[PDB]
UniProtKB/Swiss-Prot annotation:
Tissue: Ubiquitously expressed.
Protein name per UniProt: Bromodomain-containing protein 4
Note: JQ1, a thieno-triazolo-1,4-diazepine derivative, and I-BET, a benzodiazepine derivative, have been tested on tumors with success. Treatment with GSK1210151A (I-BET151, a I-BET derivative) has strong effets on mixed lineage leukemia and promotes myeloid differentiation and leukemia stem-cell depletion.
Species for this entry: Homo sapiens (Human)
Cross-link (Glycyl lysine isopeptide (Lys-Gly) (interchain with G-Cter in SUMO2)): 59
Function summary: Chromatin reader protein that recognizes and binds acetylated histones and plays a key role in transmission of epigenetic memory across cell divisions and transcription regulation. Remains associated with acetylated chromatin throughout the entire cell cycle and provides epigenetic memory for postmitotic G1 gene transcription by preserving acetylated chromatin status and maintaining high-order chromatin structure. During interphase, plays a key role in regulating the transcription of signal-inducible genes by associating with the P-TEFb complex and recruiting it to promoters.
């Protein structure tokens, strides 16, 4: 009846690459801190709508994003500007709030990670 879309692209080999203080901070400080949070595990890979039986997930969410994709993107120097990476983290949180309702365990988890994300991102060098 329903299948998953392909996961987001994690490499852009025809684009030029660079290291900046903000991109290193996004990988080694922001992503590293969120990845090891007690409630990070549902956000470390794309939503498997097939395994989780969510046939409406990819009908409601057209810009899926997850930390596993952000991690691979940062490791492949996918981002040239730190604001592109920040936008992917914000898309991941906004998708969770769009699909789910307050009081849902996944939302409580998302709100805790979002608080930690905002604390580290507000200190962006
Ligand atoms: C939905 C949704 N919307 N945004 N996100 C980011 C999600 C999301 C993403 N990944 C997982 C996920 C990955 C898993 F591997 C497992 C296993 C197979 C081990 O059970 C469960 C997983 N669930 C559960 C879940 C929530 C609602 C409906 C069905 C399943 C959560 C997990 C946390 O506790 C509460 C229930 C996810 C929800
Ligand atoms: Na909601």
């Amino acid at each position: 009846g329903h299948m998953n879309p392909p996961p987001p692209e994690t490499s852009n080999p025809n684009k030029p690459k660079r290291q900046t203080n903000q991109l290193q901070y996004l990988l080694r400080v922001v992503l590293k801190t969120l990845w090891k949070h007690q409630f990070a595990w549902p956000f470390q890979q794309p939503v498997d709508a097939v395994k989780l039986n969510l046939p409406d997930y990819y009908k409601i969410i057209k810009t899926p994003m997850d930390m596993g994709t952000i991690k691979k993107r940062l490791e492949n120097n996918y981002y040239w500007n730190a604001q592109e990476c920040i936008q992917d983290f914000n898309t991941m949180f906004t998708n969770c709030y769009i699909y789910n309702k307050p009081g849902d365990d996944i939302v409580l988890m998302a709100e805790a990670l979002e608080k930690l994300f905002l604390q580290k991102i507000n200190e962006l060098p």
